Amino acid sequence: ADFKFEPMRSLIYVDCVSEDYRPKLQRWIYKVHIPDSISQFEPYVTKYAFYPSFPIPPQGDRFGYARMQLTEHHWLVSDLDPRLEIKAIAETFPMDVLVWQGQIPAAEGNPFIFAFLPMWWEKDLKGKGRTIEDGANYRFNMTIGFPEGVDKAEGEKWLFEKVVPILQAAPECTRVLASAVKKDINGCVMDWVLEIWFENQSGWYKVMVDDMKALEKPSWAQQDAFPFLKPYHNVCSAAVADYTPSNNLANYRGYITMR
Amino acid sequence: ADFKFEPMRSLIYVDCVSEDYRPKLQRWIYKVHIPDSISQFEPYVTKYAFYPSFPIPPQGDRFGYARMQLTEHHWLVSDLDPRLEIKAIAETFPMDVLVWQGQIPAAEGNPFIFAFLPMWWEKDLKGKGRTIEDGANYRFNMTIGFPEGVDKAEGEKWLFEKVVPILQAAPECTRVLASAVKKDINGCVMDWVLEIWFENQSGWYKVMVDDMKALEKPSWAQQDAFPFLKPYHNVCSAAVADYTPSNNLANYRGYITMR
Amino acid sequence: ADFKFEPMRSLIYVDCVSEDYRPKLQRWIYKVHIPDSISQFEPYVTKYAFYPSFPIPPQGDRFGYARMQLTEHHWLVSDLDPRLEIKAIAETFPMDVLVWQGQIPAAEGNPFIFAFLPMWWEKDLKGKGRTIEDGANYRFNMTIGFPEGVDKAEGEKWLFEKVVPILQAAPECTRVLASAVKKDINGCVMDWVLEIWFENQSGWYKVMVDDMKALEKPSWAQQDAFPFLKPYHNVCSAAVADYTPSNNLANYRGYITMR
Amino acid sequence: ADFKFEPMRSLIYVDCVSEDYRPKLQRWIYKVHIPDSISQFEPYVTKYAFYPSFPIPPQGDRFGYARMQLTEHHWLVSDLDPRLEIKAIAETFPMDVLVWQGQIPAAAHTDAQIDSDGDAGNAARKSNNAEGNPFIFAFLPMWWEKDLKGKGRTIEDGANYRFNMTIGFPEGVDKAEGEKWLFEKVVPILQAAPECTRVLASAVKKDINGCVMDWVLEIWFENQSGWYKVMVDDMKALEKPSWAQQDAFPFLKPYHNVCSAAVADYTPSNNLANYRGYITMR
Amino acid sequence: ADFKFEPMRSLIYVDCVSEDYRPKLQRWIYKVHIPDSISQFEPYVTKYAFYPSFPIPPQGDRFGYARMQLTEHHWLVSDLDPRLEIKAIAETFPMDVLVWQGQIPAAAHTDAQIDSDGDAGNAARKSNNAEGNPFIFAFLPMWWEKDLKGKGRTIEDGANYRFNMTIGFPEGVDKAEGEKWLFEKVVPILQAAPECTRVLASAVKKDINGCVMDWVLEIWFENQSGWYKVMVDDMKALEKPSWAQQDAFPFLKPYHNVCSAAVADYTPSNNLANYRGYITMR
Amino acid sequence: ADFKFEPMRSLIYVDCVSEDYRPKLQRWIYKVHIPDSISQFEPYVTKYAFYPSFPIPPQGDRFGYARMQLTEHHWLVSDLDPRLEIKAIAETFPMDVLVWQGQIPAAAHTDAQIDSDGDAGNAARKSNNAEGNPFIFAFLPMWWEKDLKGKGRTIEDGANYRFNMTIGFPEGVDKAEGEKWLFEKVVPILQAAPECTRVLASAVKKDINGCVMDWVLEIWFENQSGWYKVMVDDMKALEKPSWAQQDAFPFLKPYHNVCSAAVADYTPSNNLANYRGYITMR
Numbered sequence A, B, C: 001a002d003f004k005f006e007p008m009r010s011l012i013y014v015d016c017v018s019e020d021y022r023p024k025l026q027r028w029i030y031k032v033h034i035p036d037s038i039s040q041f042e043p044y045v046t047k048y049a050f051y052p053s054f055p056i057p058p059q060g061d062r063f064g065y066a067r068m069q070l071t072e073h074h075w076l077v078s079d080l081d082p083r084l085e086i087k088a089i090a091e092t093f094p095m096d097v098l099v100w101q102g103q104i105p106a107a108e109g110n111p112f113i114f115a116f117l118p119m120w121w122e123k124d125l126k127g128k129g130r131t132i133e134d135g136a137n138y139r140f141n142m143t144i145g146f147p148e149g150v151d152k153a154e155g156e157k158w159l160f161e162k163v164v165p166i167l168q169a170a171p172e173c174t175r176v177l178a179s180a181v182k183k184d185i186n187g188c189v190m191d192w193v194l195e196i197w198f199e200n201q202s203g204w205y206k207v208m209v210d211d212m213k214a215l216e217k218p219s220w221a222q223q224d225a226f227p228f229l230k231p232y233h234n235v236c237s238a239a240v241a242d243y244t245p246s247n248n249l250a251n252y253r254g255y256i257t258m259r
Numbered sequence D, E, F: 001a002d003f004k005f006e007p008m009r010s011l012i013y014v015d016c017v018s019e020d021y022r023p024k025l026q027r028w029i030y031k032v033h034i035p036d037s038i039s040q041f042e043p044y045v046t047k048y049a050f051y052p053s054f055p056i057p058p059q060g061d062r063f064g065y066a067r068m069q070l071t072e073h074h075w076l077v078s079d080l081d082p083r084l085e086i087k088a089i090a091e092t093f094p095m096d097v098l099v100w101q102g103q104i105p106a107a108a109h110t111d112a113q114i115d116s117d118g119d120a121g122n123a124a125r126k127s128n129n130a131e132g133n134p135f136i137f138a139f140l141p142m143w144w145e146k147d148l149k150g151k152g153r154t155i156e157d158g159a160n161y162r163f164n165m166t167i168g169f170p171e172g173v174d175k176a177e178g179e180k181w182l183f184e185k186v187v188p189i190l191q192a193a194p195e196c197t198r199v200l201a202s203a204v205k206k207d208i209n210g211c212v213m214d215w216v217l218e219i220w221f222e223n224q225s226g227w228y229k230v231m232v233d234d235m236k237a238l239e240k241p242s243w244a245q246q247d248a249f250p251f252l253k254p255y256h257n258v259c260s261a262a263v264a265d266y267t268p269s270n271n272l273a274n275y276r277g278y279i280t281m282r
């Protein structure tokens, strides 16, 4: 039967719940998981990259901050088509990975957030026309999912009519982009992915912590302050640079170790 | 004037009928054929690779064993769409290649077997969940086409009800995958491609030669023992390693000669 | 919210209107524009290449000869879909580029010609079967657009019944290929792209200047001799080699400067 | 005249003194500096790589911890030969980089290209402003000189938290007596600790560029907790030397007489093989 | 404490003694060993490549035919300098690899890491076990010393069947006498045969690592039949030397005093340039 | 015997004497010659690159302007050591290449491989036919010896029109006298011109291969108009030397005692890193 052309970009928010786990998790990612993953999807994924997170900022924990990385894929077909379940070689995936990332507690576990999007941002709300010449960006990529039972249209209205205007009013914020999550692909609980750029951490803080104190607490709030959503369950995020050396289809040459 | 998205994996079974032809055939493949091919299909083939065959095992001749390599393409469009017949630069093809591969005797000819498949295996019959951590595989890839006149459903039933249970019972066999050949693309006479993994040549032989002696000779048989098909005409195969260095779109740097 | 699978090859005719602009234009292209472009379209462009123009041949100015290069993209999706207008990082594009290329004058400016085509030539009009072994080609790529008010079918008929037979008849011409421009993509004013191969510049001249003197001047002619179309507005062209080192998705490593 | 074959490995300890500087410094390193550097030395440097530092561990500030990265080169000739001062294209090197790294304090007009009589990049790499931290650039032989613990360890043995530390004894301290202290008092503590899986050391080639450091050591643990147990708690058993410039081990002035970084076994920034220009996220 | 500039080409003759071992040995080589090796010597080896052996020709066993590959390095310094024994990460080298290649007989617990006083990889590469075949690692200059037939041959002249053979004369045989036999009796048979298109030779650098071999020759043919016609049938003309260890040419004990491989002009496994990790078939 | 460590940069001035030859010469260089060359010297050449020439400026013919490219190598050992004459595979090198480049006049049977008693490529590269132009292959140190103008210029300062010129004084002229004219009369005119942003020079290493040239200079401008203003108009102030072989600067015989090219700062043809075979346009 036919396979549908379905160009998409996806983001996975990869936490590391203890610094003691960092060397093991990073080793699995770069030594074991890159080659397994390239082996599977090289013919139908056009780009596969990791964007290591900047140091977690003050209060970043309340935003479900991914302390390892954002993992990004660009797909030509849906990876959730049931025909793609079959693989000659399955990935080497120890249970420990789920512990390191926080899906399994070693107090409450966190879901694994794997959000599919169109390849192009749907909404350009601030900073259209910004070029790389204009300077280094502190790119705060945030996904949110309204609580079960909350009308999606109500939440959309809050996000674009109450939240985004505070971003627009802050000169510290240089860029605001958004897309709806493709819920039809894999059941992801998130509803929106936004990327919100600052010059630096102080600017992120000024706007996302201090300026947002102006917002009323919504009746569905899951925490007392913005983003008003349960960390790691209904909000995940990461702050990343413009560039990553881990453009894995182009740049990987095996696990070469330091002398 | 639309072009259909038609993601496919194809396999060509490349023999070398005499050791005296090996240097010439290998030279044409790596020095001439790679650059011509990449020149033509770089924009719509996402992977192009050669898997050199392991040394022919005992009785491998009876299985249409490809003594040079399996050639693998992953396509985004059908190469058989008539619009793709037009090429700025046509491939440099000495017709001696056909002598070297055995399509032309220098003895009747053997056909050129080029089988199109979906990119993902259709049936996972044994070893689901095996990872590269489980060990090196001796991967026996075999394509079969039932003789003219044999009902294809009764061939399918023999294959899955008599042959595959013998693989399932053998501990030497670690993996069985299969896909129906896309006969609609190019007229290929083959009906199935299977891949059957062992630890080694001895395991391959214990199962595919000794255990298969329990099978009854079908009425349509073209040889006396399994696979009961005419070698190189109705069955072709190769045993290959998990890995090849000949991943041509990523790894080719021109024909560099030994000093 | 589906994206259509629309594989296409596009060509941009990049002039350099004074030699004093060459170092600046070339620097912008290779230092600034390559990384901007790759950043944008890596997940949906399978090939991106520059073919530097051979030295402008005698009377080449009358063919809208692009004195810098042909820029070539192979797309999987239409870049003119309005959803693709949104980009996180906009290309660094100084106004000076348009002066250097000749869109912005100083006497008259020239349009920016960006012609979309199918990935495979539609008409193979001479030289089918030619291989790279047959020798080095002087590849003259020319796009034409009939003037405003001229009936397109009447231009087509002139092109294929009067112009092409002269090319076909000349032993100096080794290859003729043509496609209709996909005018529905971006409104490009051109109607056809042809590629016409010679051994060298002398052969080009013999045919495209001397043999073409046999044509009657059409009633819509915008200049006295073939191509009878206004240079850079209704005709653009470049002569290029079979090979380019600038296959940018595979070969670019940053702007490494000479020692 | 001839050029001497002089194979060496060098290490530069790159700090980032405020998180607000991080995006700017990182951009300069990866977008501007890599291409300038590769352009200059491609013909005589066989490896050029960056090892980004793990998050600064508790009390890492006392060890001159580099909050950005370790920069590593493998040379075939000495970069400090005076004939190598001449370069067709000099590095684009604003004074801001020294501010971001902590070599100099923040100031007006630091977007300006560095000024020196000779090469800007070479001069920046000798920075020693009394109000900042010196620029530490240590040359070594390509092979570790002393293997003091964990010989035979393979990559199959597991992920390492590799703590690379360089030390330089203070002005007036006899080098031979610092050496003896290092190898007879310090190193036995590392050997005794089950948490330390490797100890390697080389003498700094001071003759190359006047680097004030004397030794580079690399000391491996499983993780930050192991590093802390050994390098902070276990070292409390040491007597404070008469020359100490701080109260606890390393007893040396942070960022002036000791620099360090903890890094992973692998880096994706193997720049002569892996760099493809400054591709930006979509 | 200087390191000498010592440009060299080395060849290792890699056998596979049973077809059942091939998938395991090939996996170790390509999945495990490449990255360990590149990690160790990237800064001072300018090329590292594998040339898989063509199928063993008839009577190839008598020439110590390597059934897996030739491994080739181009070195800038001697790997045998004792300072190069020290390695941050040692090679993952199970004893099994020695069984698969035929250095040692099969035995219990050969999945263990090689046990050595010094570096395991270096020890492995000196394997010289009485019940197996020695590990043959021959160092050469980068340029062939003697060009004896086919000077001026280009790649346009056609595909070569390149037979690379190393020989070492037995215990007690004068080296000058063996040299004289090689060049005055053996080589003129190659020169007369039109099936032989190329003859090249170099003296083994015996001083680097104690290699028992004395010469490396490379001898080209069009194909296996040409090889056999010359190296088997034409060589029957030679008289059997008094030192002979087998009845026919090469008159040397297979795998101990002669190793060989027939290889193609090109390899995809130019590892410093072409390796991208162990990507597995779908 | 040992090989001397001899790091050098070499330049070859590649002309194309007729536009009709351009497709053929260009094909040979990129399709045939790159792989033959990389095959030979990958282990001891650290960089191999082609810089295509900008279009020949007005009066460029009087400067021996290379209408194809500059070919650049960075060597670790001398290519002219006699031991390097031996090569397993010689370059595919038809006489026609010498026609295309202007080393020899056009003639029958020039598709023939070059015939030499030693290596054909090395012999091609010593071409010096009385009816053509010699083959100019100049060896230099890897670092410019003299920095005479524009020290400290970065790539941020803008695009360069880089005019690389080599000169050799005629038979009989005292080399010290030529040197003094170059540096006391010619260079000051470059230093004085505001259009000139950079002047670098090195002495040709004449001991390597007997190159006739004595100096290589690189002289930068903004563009072709700047080049002409300085190198044609400003140079009219110079007195004609008594050894002049043409009436105006450079006063040397085009293509025999002066060769040159104007090139950009960047080339895509960094051949050891960037070459992936001869992929043809669709």
Ligand SMILES: O=C(/C=C/c1ccc(O)cc1)c1c(O)cc(O)cc1O
Binding pocket: B097, B098, B103, B104, B109, B110, B111, B112
């Ligand atoms: O033309 C090819 C094969 C044709 C064929 C020849 C003989 C048969 O009995 C069946 C098919 C062909 C090939 O064998 C190899 C290749 O790489 C490209 C080809 O077109």
Ligand SMILES: O=C1C[C@@H](c2ccc(O)cc2)Oc2cc(O)cc(O)c21
Binding pocket: A012, A014, A029, A037, A071, A079, A097, A101
């Ligand atoms: O890179 C990915 C992809 C993902 C995945 C698995 C299977 C599949 O079919 C598609 C994607 O699994 C992961 C699990 C992780 O913990 C961390 C990651 O970075 C990833």
Ligand SMILES: O=C1C[C@@H](c2ccc(O)cc2)Oc2cc(O)cc(O)c21
Binding pocket: A098, A103, A104, A105, A109, A110, A111, A112, A233
């Ligand atoms: O991998 C998961 C998903 C996770 C989960 C989901 C949703 C949610 O709201 C909280 C946790 O629960 C778990 C609990 C476990 O013991 C082990 C697990 O592997 C998991």
Ligand SMILES: O=C1C[C@@H](c2ccc(O)cc2)Oc2cc(O)cc(O)c21
Binding pocket: C098, C103, C104, C105, C108, C109, C110, C111, C112, C233
């Ligand atoms: O970019 C353009 C296009 C150009 C033009 C378009 C179409 C055509 O037929 C002729 C010229 O006119 C211009 C005139 C300007 O002052 C500045 C410009 O940027 C331009």
Ligand SMILES: O=C1C[C@@H](c2ccc(O)cc2)Oc2cc(O)cc(O)c21
Binding pocket: D012, D014, D029, D033, D037, D040, D071, D079, D097, D101, D121, D125
């Ligand atoms: O990456 C390098 C290269 C280094 C260097 C360049 C040229 C040279 O000759 C010697 C060293 O300078 C630097 C200075 C830094 O602050 C940070 C860095 O990462 C680097």
Ligand SMILES: O=C1C[C@@H](c2ccc(O)cc2)Oc2cc(O)cc(O)c21
Binding pocket: E012, E014, E029, E033, E037, E040, E041, E071, E079, E097, E101, E121, E125
């Ligand atoms: O590929 C190599 C590299 C070689 C080697 C590594 C490091 C070193 O220092 C010297 C040699 O060891 C080997 C040993 C083998 O059995 C087979 C091999 O292919 C190789």
Ligand SMILES: O=C1C[C@@H](c2ccc(O)cc2)Oc2cc(O)cc(O)c21
Binding pocket: F012, F014, F029, F033, F037, F040, F071, F079, F097, F101, F121, F125
């Ligand atoms: O590209 C080169 C390499 C050069 C060369 C090869 C081998 C060697 O030993 C020395 C030099 O020969 C050439 C000769 C040319 O006409 C044009 C060229 O571009 C070149």
Ligand SMILES: [Cl-]
Binding pocket: A017, A018, A019, A020
């Ligand atoms: Cl923690």
Ligand SMILES: [Cl-]
Binding pocket: A134, A135, A136, D024, D027
């Ligand atoms: Cl900035």
Ligand SMILES: [Cl-]
Binding pocket: A222, A223, A224, A225
């Ligand atoms: Cl709260």
Ligand SMILES: [Cl-]
Binding pocket: B134, B135, B136, E024, E027
């Ligand atoms: Cl195994």
Ligand SMILES: [Cl-]
Binding pocket: B223, B224, B225
């Ligand atoms: Cl039978």
Ligand SMILES: [Cl-]
Binding pocket: C017, C018, C019, C020
């Ligand atoms: Cl002009």
Ligand SMILES: [Cl-]
Binding pocket: C134, C135, C136, F024, F027
């Ligand atoms: Cl030709």
Ligand SMILES: [Cl-]
Binding pocket: C222, C223, C224, C225
């Ligand atoms: Cl006119």
Ligand SMILES: [Cl-]
Binding pocket: A024, A027, D157, D158, D159
């Ligand atoms: Cl681990």
